[PDB]
């Protein structure tokens, strides 16, 4: 066939009920995730090919970068609660991987301040129980698919994107193939 299990996607043998439709996992410590965000704009190009009525979820993971990795999952929860994902994603990647100026929770906070979120507002979100359960959701979702690797995408709690089985000669071709596969899996 053209799309075959174990080729452009794998099937979970332990399918996950009540999962978000399109679920993406990442880490600001994850180098391909940096690529997925800055260079390839994967999340974006997928949305452009997803149907009417499909919501897109993206979660951070703990298993890279130790104590800062966890700080970063809470911070992403703050970002989701405030709706400021599009303003902090890039300086967080670049602060962790490019300039390496993010070394503590306080440096993470600085990115939010610089991005125009107010101190009072960041610290109140940081410390709120709404952010705690949002942290809990991110962790529960990673837990349900026994996640050991990022970047990762899951469709309808049963399919996992397998980017290794797509070719990377051409960046644009890789992206479209990736998105088209998400579209295929979506309609399944």
Query: Three-state secondary structure along the chain?
Result: CCCCECCCEEECCCCCCCCCCEEEEECCCCHHHHHHHHCCCHHHHHHCCCCCCCCEEEEECCCCCHHHHHHHHHHHHHHHHHCCHHHHHHHHHHHHHHCCCCCCHHHHHHHHHHCCCCHHHHHHHHCCHHHHHHHHHHHHHHHHCCCCCCCEEEECCCEEECHHHCCCCCHHHHHHHHHHHHHHHHCC
Domain that holds residue 3: 1-188
Spatial distance between the Cα atoms of 160 and 6, rounded to a whole number of angstroms: 10
Q: What CATH number is associated with residue 46? A: 3.40.30.10
Phi, psi values for residue 126, rounded to 5°: -45, -35
Q: Using CA atoms of 143, 148, 150, 155 in order, give the dihedral in degrees to the nearest 10.
A: -50
* Number of domain units in the chain: 1
* CA angle 2–25–137, rounded 5-degree value: 125
Q: By what method was this entry solved?
A: X-ray
| C-alpha radius of gyration, the chain, whole number | 17
- Resolution reached, in Å? 2.2
**The residue count for the chain:** 188
* Contacting residues for 30 by C-beta, under 8 A, at least 6 apart: 64, 150, 151
């Amino acid at each position: 066939a053209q799309y075959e299990d174990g080729k452009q996607y794998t099937t979970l043998e332990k399918p996950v009920a009540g999962a978000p439709q399109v679920l993406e996992f990442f880490s600001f410590f994850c180098p391909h995730c940096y690529q997925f965000e800055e260079v390839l704009h994967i999340s974006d190009n997928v949305k452009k090919k997803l149907p009417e009525g499909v919501k897109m979820t993206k979660y951070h993971v703990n298993f890279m970068g130790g104590d800062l990795g966890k700080d970063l999952t809470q911070a992403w929860a703050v970002a989701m609660a405030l709706g400021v994902e599009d303003k902090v994603t890039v300086p967080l990647f670049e602060g962790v991987q490019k300039t390496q100026t993010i070394r503590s929770a306080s440096d993470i906070r600085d990115v939010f301040i610089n991005a125009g979120i107010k101190g009072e507002e960041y610290d109140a979100a940081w410390n709120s129980f709404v952010v705690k359960s949002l942290v809990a959701q991110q962790e529960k979702a990673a837990a349900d698919v026994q996640l050991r690797g990022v970047p990762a995408m899951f469709v309808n709690g049963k399919y996992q994107l397998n980017p290794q089985g797509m070719d990377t000669s051409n960046m644009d071709v890789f992206v479209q193939q990736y998105a088209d596969t998400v579209k295929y899996l979506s309609e399944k």
